[PDB]
Amino acid sequence: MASMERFLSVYDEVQAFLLDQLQSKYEIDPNRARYLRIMMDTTCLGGKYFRGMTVVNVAEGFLAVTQHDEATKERILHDACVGGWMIEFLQAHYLVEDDIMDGSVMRRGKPCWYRFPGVTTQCAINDGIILKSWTQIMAWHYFADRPFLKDLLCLFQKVDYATAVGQMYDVTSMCDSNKLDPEVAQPMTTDFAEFTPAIYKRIVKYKTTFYTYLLPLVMGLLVSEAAASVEMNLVERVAHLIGEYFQVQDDVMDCFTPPEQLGKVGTDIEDAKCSWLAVTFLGKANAAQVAEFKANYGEKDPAKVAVVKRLYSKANLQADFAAYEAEVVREVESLIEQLKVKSPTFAESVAVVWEKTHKR
Amino acid sequence: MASMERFLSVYDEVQAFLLDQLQSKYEIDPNRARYLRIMMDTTCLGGKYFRGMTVVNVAEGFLAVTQHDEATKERILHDACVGGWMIEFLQAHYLVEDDIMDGSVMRRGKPCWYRFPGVTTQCAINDGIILKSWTQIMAWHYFADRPFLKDLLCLFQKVDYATAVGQMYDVTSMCDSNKLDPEVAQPMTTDFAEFTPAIYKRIVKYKTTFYTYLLPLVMGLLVSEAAASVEMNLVERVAHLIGEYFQVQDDVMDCFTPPEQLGKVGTDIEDAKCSWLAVTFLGKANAAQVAEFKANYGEKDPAKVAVVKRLYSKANLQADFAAYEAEVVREVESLIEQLKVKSPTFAESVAVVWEKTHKR
Ligand SMILES: CN1CCN(c2nc3ccccc3s2)CC1
Ligand SMILES: CN1CCN(c2nc3ccccc3s2)CC1
Ligand SMILES: CN1CCN(c2nc3ccccc3s2)CC1
Ligand SMILES: CN1CCN(c2nc3ccccc3s2)CC1
Ligand SMILES: [Zn+2]
Ligand SMILES: [Zn+2]
Ligand SMILES: [Zn+2]
Ligand SMILES: [Zn+2]
């Protein structure tokens, strides 16, 4: 059975379990069950399932080199699929809430969930809460007897917390740290002294890399009972590295990829986000360019945004990106080599993860 | 050491742990640590701590009848305090998000957290996410070696899920179930056919009773390793019963308690909530009264709200409340008697919980 075919089949099974449980144990009525079914499909489906499929792919790699009864192979693949859906539903939670938090309009060519006419923000915040609650329902049901349940739940929590801390770093990245204060309305930075590579890397590490790369890789190891085949410090280093490159690509696409391709109108400039483009531009601009950036960044005015986009183009950030990518390619390959020491199979899975990231 | 004194001391210890961990493991800077410290204090402190103290009180009851070394008594009391704070932080999460969802203005005489000038909804949604994440950080840290960790985490999840499902029932309680549809903007019911005692009881059971009564009582049993001293079906029945009475009191106060005493301006009428007052009024109104209620309920117009308040007063719902309370007093006492069969100590703790609920 092909990997994606199995993964999608498990979605239907998990969805049926969750909705049937809501009827048998939570007194749900059929119309609310239908609401939640539509909410699940709308928020969890339609992507490429890269995070969930990484769990499956890691587990398949170990299956090829480990002796098991057929029923055990099937159990491991089913576990990897459920775990992959835990990650996809966790991402769904983040995307629903982030879209509300940022006042976003579109995601993947369709309206953000909170903007659907019969949803609204009042329901959508709670729908997002439910999406994350469903990840825990999945784990306690499907993994109740598994030796890895404890380690999996502990990992999932730590990843979730790191991601929420990362969201805090992201939403406050255009403030001056010394001015943060619940009592005082927050002005945008004027000096941009905190738009540095180290601060950018901290934002991205926490807001993206734990749930997009560390979680799927480690969950694949856990459902495979293979965490001893790897040096965990190496898995963390390579996950944070690939994850940062993934976010840098996203940052570049927000500015330069056409809306129809992006599936949304990017507003990192109007939102004054600490993007890779802003940080890298400031790391090479002269005094006049810095001043013109300061006069235009973080404003909704289309003329001011266009000015920022000119400044980026004229700064030849394409060359900086090729240099960054060359260094990431160098460093990921080095970490993969270190991973072959204890597991050529896992190192090959990481290699596949990197190719899928690098090509898109 | 007095119970409340110990409970508050543990707050400072937990807060110090969480913030110190954010510095040592999450790369936090001192200004964001201060933001989160203020957010924690503002959202978690200032109430009566009834839920958290119930854990402590249940554990103290067992301590009085169970042989332990002194260090073990101290460990149990510390565990009960941490568990109580897990519940208070979970409530803090719900209140932050509910206030955003409902567009609330005040809570306990102070602005809702999202309305603080340097917070805003963009930060406050995530602050609420962090509050719940902190409950899991607490459990995995303080209870890492405890035999009850698994049972406690599983219970906490189920309670959280039931509460989120309850919030869905609450926010959709003024819609017609057959009309729910993400694609279509939701009109308020016109027939109010779903304002029934059974439907009201389902809302309250899920939205309030699991986290306010079932969770503190069962957590007290868990940290005491005393779940065998009770019939769990009885604990559930008494928790749901007391919890419903608690919410009925809240519903009555929303309408009739002065704002300065309530700590907010109640808007259940303008919000068209399925309150105990609306359900009970419809369960005794004549045809003309039903019509006048339909013409006025769920509108912000102060004259229409006053009309609804007149209809309630003229309907003598005070008599219905005294009848409801008399029946609850009857039924709680019956369940306490059944609880004495296996544990007079736990039955006495439940009795204390009921008195604290009944008097306020
Ligand atoms: C690729 N982006 C990574 C950061 N994302 C987050 N959204 C939330 C929402 C709530 C809590 C944490 C996070 S992190 C948005 C998508
Ligand atoms: C006609 N436009 C020319 C410039 N655009 C850019 N692509 C990148 C990629 C990486 C970093 C910066 C840029 S700017 C593409 C479309
Ligand atoms: C006494 N009320 C019980 C119901 N409350 C809830 N708020 C939320 C928020 C998010 C998820 C679930 C719930 S339940 C508000 C206070
Ligand atoms: C001057 N007002 C008289 C009526 N108010 C009510 N108190 C309750 C309590 C339980 C049920 C209904 C009502 S109406 C108190 C203040
Ligand atoms: Zn965002
Ligand atoms: Zn982006
Ligand atoms: Zn509410
Ligand atoms: Zn209320």
Between CA A46 and CA A36 the distance in angstroms is 17
Strands (E), chain A: 106-107, 110-111
B320 is in an annotated binding site: no
Helix (H) or strand (E) holding A240: helix A232-256
Closest to B129 (Cα-Cα) out of A181, A100, A213 = A100
Which residues of chain A are within 8 Å of residue B90 when distances are taken between CB atoms? none
- Cross-chain residue pair A35–B180, CB shorter than 8 Å: yes
- Cross-chain residue pair B101–A122, CB shorter than 8 Å: yes
Between CA A354 and CA A357 the distance in angstroms is 5
Rounded to the nearest 10 degrees, the angle between the axes of helix B215-223 and helix B344-359 is 150
Q: Which two tokens stand for residue B339?
A: 């609880």
Please name the residue ranges forming H helices in A257-314. Answer: 259-262, 276-282, 287-296, 302-314
Give the other-Cβ count within 10 Å of A326's Cβ. Answer: 10
Compute, in angstroms, the gap from residue A111 CA to the centroid of ligand 7: 25
Cα–Cα separations (whole angstroms), residue B350 to B55, B108, B208, B212 = 11, 27, 17, 13
DSSP state for residue A209 in the 8-state scheme: I
Rounded to the nearest 10 degrees, the angle between the axes of helix B30-44 and helix B120-142 is 90
Between CA A44 and CA B68 the distance in angstroms is 50
Closest to A273 (Cα-Cα) out of A208, A225, A218, A336 = A208
Between CA B297 and CA A204 the distance in angstroms is 48
A334-337 contacts at long range (C-beta below 8 A, 24 or more positions apart): A335/A234, A335/A237, A335/A238, A335/A241, A336/A238
Give the other-Cβ count within 10 Å of A44's Cβ. Answer: 23
Between CA B218 and CA B241 the distance in angstroms is 15
Backbone angles phi and psi of B183, in degrees to 5: -80, -15
Torsion angle of alpha carbons A104, A108, A113, A114, nearest 10°?
Answer: 10
Closest to B277 (Cα-Cα) out of B325, B321, B231 = B321
> Which ligand is closest to the CA of B256, given by its number?
4
What's the burial of B295, exposed, middle or buried (CB within 10 Å: 0-12/13-18/19+)? exposed
Name the minimum distance, in Å, from the CA of A39 to any CA of chain B.
8
Between CA A88 and CA A86 the distance in angstroms is 6
CA A290 and chain centroid, separation: 31
Compute, in angstroms, the gap from residue B181 CA to the centroid of ligand 1: 27
3-state secondary structure string across chain B: CCHHHHHHHHHHHHHHHHHHHHHHHCCCCHHHHHHHHHHHHHHHCCCCCHHHHHHHHHHHHHHCCCCCCHHHHHHHHHHHHHHHHHHHHHHHHHHHHHHHHHCCCEECCEECHHHCCCCHHHHHHHHHHHHHHHHHHHHHHHCCCCCCHHHHHHHHHHHHHHHHHHHHHHHCCCCCHHHCCCCCCCCCCCCCCCCCHHHHHHHHHHHHHHHHHHHHHHHHHHHCCCHHHCCHHHHHHHHHHHHHHHHHHHHHHHHHCCHHHHCCCCCCCCCCCCCHHHHHHHCCCCHHHHHHHHHHCCCCCHHHHHHHHHHHHHCCHHHHHHHHHHHHHHHHHHHHHHHHCCCHHHHHHHHHHHHHHHHC
B102 is in an annotated binding site: yes
- Cross-chain residue pair B117–A185, CB shorter than 8 Å: yes
Name the minimum distance, in Å, from the CA of B134 to any CA of chain A.
8
Compute, in angstroms, the gap from residue B352 CA to the centroid of ligand 5: 46
Which residues of chain B are within 8 Å of residue A103 when distances are taken between CB atoms? 122
DSSP state for residue A111 in the 8-state scheme: E
The HSE-up count of residue B45 (CA atoms within 13 Å, CB side) is 14
The answer for B142, left when phi > 0, alpha when psi is -120 to 50, beta otherwise, is alpha
Closest to B140 (Cα-Cα) out of A84, A141, A159, A134 = A159
Closest to A86 (Cα-Cα) out of A134, A23, A22, A38 = A134
Instruction: Map tokens 């999460």 to a residue.
Output: B93
> By the 8 A CB rule, do A169 and A203 touch?
yes
Q: Which two tokens stand for residue A207?
A: 């807001």
Instruction: Map tokens 């540095």 to a residue.
Output: A196
Answer positive or negative: Cα dihedral of A19, A20, A26, A30.
positive
Between CA B346 and CA B352 the distance in angstroms is 10
Between CA B312 and CA B315 the distance in angstroms is 5
> Which ligand is closest to the CA of A250, given by its number?
6
> By the 8 A CB rule, do B61 and B345 touch?
yes
Residue to mutate (ligand 4; options B312, B318, B320; most atoms within 8 A of CB): B318
- Cross-chain residue pair A133–B182, CB shorter than 8 Å: no
Which residues of chain A are within 8 Å of residue B206 when distances are taken between CB atoms? 26-27
B236 is in an annotated binding site: yes
Whether the CB of A173 sits within 6 Å of ligand 1: no
Segments making up each domain of chain A, as ranges? 1-360
> Which ligand is closest to the CA of A102, given by its number?
5
User: Which chain A residue has its CA at the smallest distance from B157's CA?
Assistant: A136
Backbone angles phi and psi of B111, in degrees to 5: -60, 145
What's the burial of A204, exposed, middle or buried (CB within 10 Å: 0-12/13-18/19+)? buried
| Fold (topology level) of B1-360 | Farnesyl Diphosphate Synthase (1.10.600)
> By the 8 A CB rule, do B138 and B88 touch?
no
Between CA A56 and CA A12 the distance in angstroms is 17
DSSP state for residue A116 in the 8-state scheme: S
Cβ neighbours for A68, distance < 8 A, ≥ 6 positions apart: A76
B160 is in an annotated binding site: no
Whether the CB of A97 sits within 6 Å of ligand 1: yes
Cα–Cα separations (whole angstroms), residue A253 to A166, A316, A356, B343 = 20, 15, 17, 64
What's the burial of B143, exposed, middle or buried (CB within 10 Å: 0-12/13-18/19+)? buried
Answer positive or negative: Cα dihedral of B319, B174, A114, A139.
positive
Q: Which residues of A144-153 are buried (b: 16+ CB within 10 A; e: fewer)?
A: eebebbebbb
Between CA A165 and CA A179 the distance in angstroms is 18
What's the burial of A324, exposed, middle or buried (CB within 10 Å: 0-12/13-18/19+)? middle
Backbone angles phi and psi of B3, in degrees to 5: -60, -50
Resolution of the PDB structure in angstroms: 1.5
Compute, in angstroms, the gap from residue A313 CA to the centroid of ligand 6: 19
Compute, in angstroms, the gap from residue B123 CA to the centroid of ligand 5: 10
Name the minimum distance, in Å, from the CA of B189 to any CA of chain A.
14
CA B147 and chain centroid, separation: 27
Q: Which two tokens stand for residue A143?
A: 């993994």
Between CA B118 and CA A180 the distance in angstroms is 7
B227-232 contacts at long range (C-beta below 8 A, 24 or more positions apart): B227/B151, B229/B62, B229/B342, B229/B343, B229/B345, B229/B346, B230/B339, B230/B342, B230/B343, B230/B346, B231/B338, B231/B339, B231/B341, B231/B342
User: Which chain A residue has its CA at the smallest distance from B186's CA?
Assistant: A118
Rg of the Cα atoms in chain B: 22
Instruction: Map tokens 């993400």 to a residue.
Output: B182
Partner residue opposite A125 with nearest CB, options B100, B172, B185: B100
Instruction: Map tokens 């079914």 to a residue.
Output: A37
Report the residue of A180, A201, A203, A207 to disrupt the B interface, i.e. the one with the largest count of B CBs within 10 Å: A180
Q: Tell me which residue has its CA closest to atom 12 in ligand 4.
A: B318
Give the other-Cβ count within 10 Å of A69's Cβ. Answer: 8
Between CA A188 and CA A190 the distance in angstroms is 6
Helix (H) or strand (E) holding A213: none
Return the bridge partners of B111, or none: B106
Answer positive or negative: Cα dihedral of A331, A94, A137, A16.
negative
The answer for A160, left when phi > 0, alpha when psi is -120 to 50, beta otherwise, is alpha
Torsion angle of alpha carbons B237, B243, B245, B247, nearest 10°?
Answer: -150
Cβ neighbours for B38, distance < 8 A, ≥ 6 positions apart: A182
Experimental method: X-ray
Helix (H) or strand (E) holding A264: none
- Cross-chain residue pair A126–B97, CB shorter than 8 Å: yes
Torsion angle of alpha carbons B101, B107, B112, B113, nearest 10°?
Answer: -110
Between CA B207 and CA A155 the distance in angstroms is 29
Q: Which two tokens stand for residue A326?
A: 């060359």
Which residues of chain A are within 8 Å of residue B42 when distances are taken between CB atoms? 182
Cβ neighbours for A271, distance < 8 A, ≥ 6 positions apart: A102, A174, A298
Answer positive or negative: Cα dihedral of A148, A153, A154, A155.
positive
Report the residue of B25, B44, B86, B126 to disrupt the A interface, i.e. the one with the largest count of A CBs within 10 Å: B126
DSSP state for residue A178 in the 8-state scheme: G
Cα–Cα separations (whole angstroms), residue A248 to A149, A203, A254 = 33, 11, 10
Q: Which residues of A are annotated as a binding site for Zn(2+)?
A: 98, 102, 170, 236, 250, 254, 268
Helix (H) or strand (E) holding A179: none
